Amino acid sequence: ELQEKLIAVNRVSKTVKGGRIFSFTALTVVGDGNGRVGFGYGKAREVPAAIQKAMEKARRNMINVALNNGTLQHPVKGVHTGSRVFMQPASEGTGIIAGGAMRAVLEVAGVHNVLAKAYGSTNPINVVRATIDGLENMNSPEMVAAKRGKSVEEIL
């Protein structure tokens, strides 16, 4: 039922007395095609192991996102470190208009229809985080009503 996308895998080095010890970082993201999303960042001497670790990480510490049908509920900005991200709800049929790491996270989340630009840095790890933040902060109509002491029809 859960779908899992390895966004990026990057080789990182540590210099020691002998020379360079290489290792691999795997950035993954998992989701159930509904609100639940979670990214994981795993590290190991070999790639597959790292990926596995990342997946494991992702599977715990997931996060829920309120989705009005296939799309978002309102335009939402999300920032994290360099990567600042804008994403805007869009009409059925338009698809996920978004770039790179950002796209992957959206896809797993089960948003089908978005218009999304990543300003600033596009460092996958940061940008995915930013996206997640954006998703998280995004409140629903019901939630807003609850907050404000009103009905849903009062808010429209």
Partner 1 sequence: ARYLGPKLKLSRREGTDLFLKSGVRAIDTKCKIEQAPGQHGARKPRLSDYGVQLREKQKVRRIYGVLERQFRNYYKEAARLKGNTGENLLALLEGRLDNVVYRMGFGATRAEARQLVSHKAIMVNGRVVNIASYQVSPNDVVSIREKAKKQSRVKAALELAEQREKPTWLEVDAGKMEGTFKRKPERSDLSADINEHLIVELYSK
Partner RNA sequence: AUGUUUUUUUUUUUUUUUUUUGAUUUGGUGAGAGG
Partner RNA sequence: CCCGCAGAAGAAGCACCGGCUAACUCCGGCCAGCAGCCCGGUAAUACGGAGGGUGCAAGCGUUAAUCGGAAUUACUGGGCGUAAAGCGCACGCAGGCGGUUUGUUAAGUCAGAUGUGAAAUCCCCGGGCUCAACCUGGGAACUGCAUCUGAUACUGGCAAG
Residue 2's binding partner out of RNA, partner 1, none, with CB under 5 to 8 Å set by partner kind = RNA
- On the 0-12 / 13-18 / 19+ scale of CB atoms within 10 A, 109 is buried
Residue 112's binding partner out of partner 1, RNA, none, with CB under 5 to 8 Å set by partner kind = partner 1
Residues in CB range of 31: below 8 A, 6 or more apart: 2, 3, 4, 37, 38, 62, 105, 107, 108, 109, 110
How many C-beta atoms surround the C-beta of residue 144 within 10 A? 14
C-alpha torsion 70→35→104→81, nearest 10 = 120
Smallest separation (angstroms) from partner 1 to the CB of 95 = 5
How many C-beta atoms surround the C-beta of residue 151 within 10 A? 9
Residue 129's binding partner out of RNA, partner 1, none, with CB under 5 to 8 Å set by partner kind = none
DSSP annotation string for 78-93: EEETTEEEEEEE--TT
Smallest separation (angstroms) from partner 1 to the CB of 32 = 19
Smallest separation (angstroms) from RNA to the CB of 154 = 24
| 95 makes contact with partner 1 (CB under 8 A) | yes
- The piece of 35-43, 44-52, 95-103, 134-142 that touches partner 1 (CB under 8 A) is 95-103
Residue bearing tokens 């849903």: 152
| 105 makes contact with partner 1 (CB under 8 A) | no
Smallest separation (angstroms) from RNA to the CB of 137 = 17
| 53 makes contact with partner 1 (CB under 8 A) | no
From the list 103, 125, 126, 132, which residue makes contact with partner 1 (rule: CB under 8 A)? 103
List of residues contacting partner 1 (CB under 8 A):
92-97, 103, 112
